[PDB]
Design a protein around this ligand. Structure first.
Ligand SMILES: [Ca+2]
Length: 371
């Protein structure tokens, strides 16, 4: 079901559970006419008591600023998540006001207030719970999000589209869902909340945590004391999760020696794709993203370390992209990677390059007037 909220209208798509993810994908793209996804970053952690220090908030702000600058992506921030997420919605709205990034409010309907008012045309839902009015879209209804992620990581010049999850100041309730994410072939990045526990407990000489989990749950958020059976279940859960480390990665941005947000993103992405397979056609999308960030160090060190083998045949599209974007370092790297200009350059390709002249340029006006 399609609906609009004249609040500047926000879209509502009825989300019946166990629906086809491809159906929702097609509905979103068609009805919303939004650009193709170059990246899909989904949030998994949000809490009202969750507070962000100035450093982590700034590196989150600078990161989203750089993301909206060149690449643009989709931030699957669940609506009706009142807390720190509303500030994120206001911030992304202000930064987009200042290629573009989009945010989707994939959220249920039970926790929303005035749900009967919107169920049965500006639906006024003024509640002092209601959803954050900073977002301009929503999907009205964890398994749905996981299946949507598994679907997006399967949609496919044969290019893929990356998908990543970013958790921030999570609660011990997402852990179960998090386990499914380990089986969903999706990379995960950890920094605030239970994230500190998951980080300090991911690398240990002892695989199982029969007693350290209790000490962690006691030292961290000691307001709620859970049952011992729950702690044993969650210890087994964390064991089964950390059984697969090559998809999970943690980094500390407060150490003052941290690399930029965009860097670790691509680092974890290539780390995941390396364990996924070694197909040259695989790393393409992420590689394109690297060009979008002008990141050459990680391009040469990680991608072109000699592990994967490159053939002159596949580099054509990415080389053209690097050329039109005016980034000579990557051109040098590619031509040193075996790509030969002698056979790549054709008169049709050369005309294409001329067809790629920017309209506001002077050469464009000169050629147009001459024509
Ligand atoms: Ca890939």
């Amino acid at each position: 079901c399609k609906g609009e909220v004249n609040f500047k209208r926000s879209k509502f798509v009825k989300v019946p559970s166990n629906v086809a993810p491809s159906m929702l994908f097609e509905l979103l793209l068609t009805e919303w006419h939004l650009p193709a996804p170059n990246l899909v970053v989904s949030l998994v952690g949000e809490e009202r008591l969750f507070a962000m220090k100035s450093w982590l908030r700034d590196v989150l702000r600078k990161g989203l600023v750089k993301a909206a600058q060149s690449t643009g992506a989709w931030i699957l921030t669940s609506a009706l998540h009142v807390g720190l997420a509303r500030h994120v919605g206001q911030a992304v709205r202000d930064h987009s006001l200042a290629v573009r990034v989009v945010a989707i409010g994939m959220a249920s309907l039970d926790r929303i207030l005035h749900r009967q008012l919107l169920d049965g045309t500006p639906i006024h839902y003024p509640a002092d719970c209601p959803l954050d009015s900073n977002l301009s879209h929503f999907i009205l209804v964890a398994e749905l999000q996981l299946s949507l992620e598994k679907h997006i990581s399967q949609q496919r010049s044969s290019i893929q589209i990356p998908v990543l999850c970013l958790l921030v100041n999570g609660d011990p309730s997402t852990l179960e869902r998090m386990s499914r994410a380990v089986e969903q072939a999706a990379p995960w990045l950890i920094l605030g909340g239970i994230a500190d526990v998951l980080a300090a407990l991911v690398g240990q000489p002892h695989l199982l945590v029969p007693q350290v989990t209790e000490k962690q749950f006691r030292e961290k958020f000691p307001s709620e004391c859970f049952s011992w059976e729950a702690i044993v279940h969650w210890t087994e859960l964390l064991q089964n999760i950390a059984a697969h480390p090559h998809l999970l990665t943690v980094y500390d941005f407060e150490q003052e020696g941290s690399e930029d947000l965009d860097t670790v993103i691509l680092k974890a992405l290539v780390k995941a794709c390396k364990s996924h397979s070694r197909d040259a056609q695989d790393y393409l999308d992420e590689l394109k993203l690297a060009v979008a960030w002008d990141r050459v160090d990680i391009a040469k060190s990680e991608i072109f370390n000699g592990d994967v083998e490159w053939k002159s045949c596949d580099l054509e599209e990415v080389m053209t992209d690097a050329l039109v974007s005016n980034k000579p370092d990557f051109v040098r790297l590619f031509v040193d990677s075996g790509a030969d200009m002698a056979e790549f350059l054709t008169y049709g390709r050369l005309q294409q390059l001329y067809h790629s002249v920017s309209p506001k340029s002077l050469l464009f006006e000169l050629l147009e007037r001459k024509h």
